[PDB]
Enzyme design. Structure first.
Site, PDB file in Angstrom:
ATOM      1  N   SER A  40     -13.194 -48.375  -8.097  1.00 39.62           N
ATOM      2  CA  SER A  40     -13.727 -50.199  -7.988  1.00 39.62           C
ATOM      3  C   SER A  40     -13.749 -49.430  -6.336  1.00 39.62           C
ATOM      4  O   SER A  40     -13.594 -50.357  -5.369  1.00 39.62           O
ATOM      5  CB  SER A  40     -13.156 -51.663  -8.322  1.00 39.62           C
ATOM      6  OG  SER A  40     -13.905 -51.610  -9.310  1.00 39.62           O
ATOM      7  N   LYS A 205      -7.176 -52.753  -1.736  1.00 36.67           N
ATOM      8  CA  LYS A 205      -8.075 -52.396  -2.455  1.00 36.67           C
ATOM      9  C   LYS A 205      -8.121 -51.469  -3.426  1.00 36.67           C
ATOM     10  O   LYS A 205      -7.587 -49.886  -3.904  1.00 36.67           O
ATOM     11  CB  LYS A 205      -9.474 -52.230  -2.174  1.00 36.67           C
ATOM     12  CG  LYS A 205     -10.254 -51.847  -3.295  1.00 36.67           C
ATOM     13  CD  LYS A 205     -11.139 -53.614  -3.574  1.00 36.67           C
ATOM     14  CE  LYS A 205     -11.574 -53.376  -4.949  1.00 36.67           C
ATOM     15  NZ  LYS A 205     -11.229 -53.123  -6.329  1.00 36.67           N
ATOM     16  N   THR A 206      -7.823 -51.919  -4.710  1.00 34.69           N
ATOM     17  CA  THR A 206      -7.593 -51.272  -6.120  1.00 34.69           C
ATOM     18  C   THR A 206      -8.881 -50.373  -6.616  1.00 34.69           C
ATOM     19  O   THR A 206      -9.885 -51.351  -6.580  1.00 34.69           O
ATOM     20  CB  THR A 206      -6.948 -52.123  -7.013  1.00 34.69           C
ATOM     21  OG1 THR A 206      -7.445 -52.911  -7.598  1.00 34.69           O
ATOM     22  CG2 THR A 206      -4.964 -52.111  -6.296  1.00 34.69           C
ATOM     23  N   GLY A 207      -8.280 -49.792  -7.458  1.00 29.49           N
ATOM     24  CA  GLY A 207      -9.275 -48.850  -8.896  1.00 29.49           C
ATOM     25  C   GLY A 207      -8.923 -48.481  -9.406  1.00 29.49           C
ATOM     26  O   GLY A 207      -8.055 -48.179  -9.658  1.00 29.49           O
TER      27      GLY A 207
END
Length: 262
Positions: A40, A205-207
Site C-alpha cells: 500500500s 505511509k505504511t504498506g
C-alpha cells in the site's frame, strides 16, 4: 553495520533501508537499491498525483465521486462508510493515504489517475526510474519473490517523497495538504514513528502485503525549528508465503537509520 545485518538475519528475510538528512546530505543505505514490493505504500504517491491534478486544474479535490452500486474492495473502511452519498476526490485521497483505503485507491485510478500505468507515469514525471505499479488493488499485493511487478527501491521511494515536499512538482498549497495527510496517517504507530523522539513531527505511509512477510514504511521526520526533514524508507520481505512480517524489525531499522543521518 553489525546491528542491521544481525537484525536482518534474525528476521529471516530481506531488509532494505534508505535514509537521508536533507539538510546535511548525510545518507544511510542498506540494500537501498534492491527491489521490494510496494504494497500500500504507493497510496501516498497516488494522493500526491491527485493533488498535482488539482494544482493543474483547481477544484479537482472538491469534485464528487459517486460509486453507489460498486462492490467495495476489502479494507475500504472510509469508502464503504460513505458509499451512500459519495465522496469528494480529496476525501478519497486522504482516505487512501491515512487509512490505506483500497476502494479509494482503485476509484482514484479508475477516474482520475489513469490506472497503475498512470500512477507509474506520475512517478516517472518526478524522475523516479525505479517505481512501477502494474496491478490494481488487491492483486498488487502478491509479493512473489523475484517478481518485479508493483515494486520500487527504498532509495527511490525516499527520493520521490523528498521531491514532493521540497518544491518540485507541488506548490506550497499542495505540499502543505500532502504533509498534513501524511502527518495524520493512522497505520504507522508501530513502525517508523515508534523510533522517533517525542516532539519530532512524523508523516508516513505504511504498506503491508499480507504475503511473504512483506511490509514497509516511509516517512519524513521534522526535528523542529524548521530543520530540513529527515527522509526514511524501510522495506522488508521474506521467503515463505505465510511468514509474518514484523513491525519491530521496521522500528529497529528506523532507529539505526535515524542515528546514522541525524
Amino acid at each position: 553495520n553489525k546491528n542491521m545485518a544481525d537484525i536482518e538475519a534474525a528476521f529471516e528475510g530481506r531488509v532494505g533501508v534508505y535514509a537521508i538528512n536533507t539538510g546535511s546530505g548525510k545518507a544511510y543505505s542498506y540494500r537501498a537499491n534492491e527491489r521490494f514490493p510496494l504494497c500500500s505504500s504507493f497510496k501516498a504517491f497516488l494522493a500526491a498525483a491527485v493533488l498535482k491534478m488539482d494544482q493543474d486544474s483547481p477544484g479537482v479535490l472538491l469534485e464528487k465521486v459517486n460509486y453507489h452500486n460498486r462492490t467495495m474492495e476489502p479494507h475500504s473502511p472510509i469508502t464503504e462508510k460513505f458509499q451512500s452519498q459519495g465522496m469528494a476526490v480529496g476525501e478519497l485521497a486522504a482516505a487512501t493515504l491515512q487509512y490505506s483505503d483500497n476502494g479509494a485507491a482503485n476509484l482514484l485510478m479508475e477516474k482520475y489517475i489513469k490506472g497503475p500505468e498512470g500512477m507509474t507515469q506520475f512517478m516517472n514525471s518526478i524522475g523516479d526510474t525505479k517505481f512501477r505499479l502494474d496491478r490494481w488493488e488487491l492483486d498488487l499485493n502478491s509479493a512473489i519473490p523475484g517478481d518485479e511487478r508493483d515494486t520500487s527501491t527504498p532509495k527511490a521511494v525516499a527520493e520521490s517523497l523528498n521531491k514532493l515536499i521540497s518544491n518540485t512538482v507541488l506548490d506550497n498549497y499542495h505540499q502543505e495538504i500532502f504533509k498534513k495527510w501524511m502527518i495524520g496517517n493512522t497505520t504507522g504507530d508501530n513502525r517508523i514513528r515508534a523510533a522517533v523522539p517525542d516532539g519530532w513531527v512524523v508523516g508516513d505511509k505504511t504498506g503491508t502485503c499480507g504475503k511473504y512477510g512483506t511490509a514497509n514504511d516511509h516517512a519524513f521526520i521534522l526535528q523542529g525549528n524548521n530543520a530540513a526533514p529527515l527522509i526514511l524508507s524501510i522495506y522488508t520481505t521474506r521467503k515463505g508465503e505465510h511468514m509474518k512480517h514484523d513491525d519491530e524489525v521496521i522500528a529497529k531499522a528506523a532507529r539505526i537509520a535515524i542515528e546514522n543521518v541525524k
